[PDB]
Design a protein around this ligand. Structure first.
Ligand SMILES: [Zn+2]
Ligand SMILES: [Zn+2]
Ligand SMILES: [Zn+2]
Ligand SMILES: [Zn+2]
Lengths: 189, 189, 189, 188
């Protein structure tokens, strides 16, 4: 332990011209998300970038009927936003940094995330990224059911809707027993 | 083929003197939940009662630190509330009706629910019970990841928090692509 | 730390009049299996009895077409054989000893075994019971995929087919990287 | 309506110069494995190539049990024989998949179950190597996930004849699998 999970913080989710952008609140966490990721890496944590990898005209994916095309394979939409992308440029080849393609909201679903964590005997996951109430929430619930201790970096998660953001934070703390931390990985009270 | 999942509609979650009761809003759905369950049964659907089964002094359960003791094995707290309980006494021994003990919020986690459904080639699960934003939500997300079509019986789910109930219904429809239905199993628009 | 898994060592699998008995070879391990289980318990290990729980006229179970009825719920066939049964009568109520019903061959499939092990941060499982090439093999493979270290108690596993017993032992050592141990929990070289 | 799973039929497992080759018995199924895959595809079945993707990784417990094999970006991962030609022709088809795997089972840490569930597939047809290792593990996972199982007997192989026979017997008698030939006809 520990492992930091970086969820869908890409151009399509964050940039103003993004295909499924969260806009201003997503852009606002850029400094915090890059700071906390660098900090975790510096102290010896494993870093998992778990990124949507969709195909256009995938009729068998139930998500294709719910949202417009986003994070399409081979497009600039899948590029990491801001200084987080710079971090991946510098340290993406490191043995402790991973890139994982995902098709569901949860970073665990149909991936080998659990396997890689169990290989390294990680007991605690630290969650960052977007959206708080969709891919972060699904990931947190999967992590809970798989018996991981959970930390949520409050200033490094965001949603389009403030009320959905608040529901999710409340769910993490009160139902999942997750620890809410700041960008310095210190517990928030 | 379809299965109705009846989540935690017991004394401890519903009755006034219940140890972890949702109170009035949970009691309010008693007529709707019993009606829809009898209807699904009449239509030849499978019925799964997925019920919290906790032990006193379970130090290894993360839930024991978050909530007071509830649905303890061998106590009246685990008895089904209202006409739903009467239905179980009348039809519990039918080959299409199941009682399933669970320890996490999701009906799938550490149970053989997925196995029983796949044996019967079920492609659609119909969700009822409490709480909308906790055991129903977790069950719905697990169902989504496992590739089931989902129906939510809107008048047969309840939470102690109205805002959380609203978040969850929105999440089911917009994120999971679930169908919202009434107590007559007719789609709501 | 460690968990010992006791697989299907019941009257139906072991006794002369057992409905699906492995007969003499299964009876031959009675001393070793009871000894190793008592030893593991004395060393502070967790003990999981993972026992077939079948229903008669379960037409949805693929196993019902392959084998005659066995380990039927509520029958004497599910009673633990030999001194193992005495151990359970003596220590079944200890917080470290578990009884788990299962429907597939693997002790993990449709059960909460993985959950209970993760709760206790168990990294290694010790396998005992019958049959070596069926419920032991399936359980070992599931354990491997879930990232557990595996120990096999060679004198405390048995099959009705000696060639199959040999295949399984070889598979455990060479393919799964399991440690073969004796009834004193000492590694065999 | 069904899905054929093509397990690890690559240069490293099959060719004489292969890093973890099964040799002659693996080479012997080349004609049958290519024929049955083409037939399955022509019928409208989904085809999943599930292929070992290893890194020369200390956290992988398999690295202490076998020499390096099927390394990412190497020619050891190329499909052997006419099967490779089929992939050239139809690899970009929406019904044909290439899945990297790190465990023996094609299901473990992959999205195989998800893709099958999306397509409402109820039956998997297993081909490839080794009968008693990546085929056996895949079959056991399929069984636990509730799939009907077919095994193409002439399109599976192992290094050891006794292990091959154990596995075939296990599939038929324990998992309830149907044994079929290269024409996808049941064997009796
Ligand atoms: Zn997406
Ligand atoms: Zn509970
Ligand atoms: Zn059995
Ligand atoms: Zn390999």
């Amino acid at each position: 332990t520990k492992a930091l999970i970086s969820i869908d913080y890409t151009e399509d989710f964050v940039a103003d011209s993004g295909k499924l952008t969260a806009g201003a609140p997503a852009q606002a966490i850029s400094d915090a998300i890059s700071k906390v990721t660098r900090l975790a890496f510096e102290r010896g944590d494993y870093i998992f970038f778990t990124i949507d990898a969709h195909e256009e005209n995938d009729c068998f994916h139930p998500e294709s009927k719910l949202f417009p095309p986003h994070n399409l394979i081979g497009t600039s939409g899948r590029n990491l936003y801001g200084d987080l992308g710079i971090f991946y440029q510098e340290h993406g080849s490191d043995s402790r940094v991973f890139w994982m393609d995902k098709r569901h909201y949860s970073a665990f679903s149909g991936t080998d995330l659990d396997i890689r964590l169990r290989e390294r005997r990680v007991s605690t996951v630290i969650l960052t990224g977007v959206l708080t109430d969709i891919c972060v929430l699904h990931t947190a619930i999967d992590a809970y059911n798989l018996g991981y201790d959970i930390e949520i970096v409050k200033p490094a998660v965001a949603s389009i809707w403030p009320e959905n953001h608040q529901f999710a934070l409340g769910h993490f703390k009160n139902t999942l027993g997750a620890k809410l931390v700041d960008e310095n990985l210190n517990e928030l009270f």
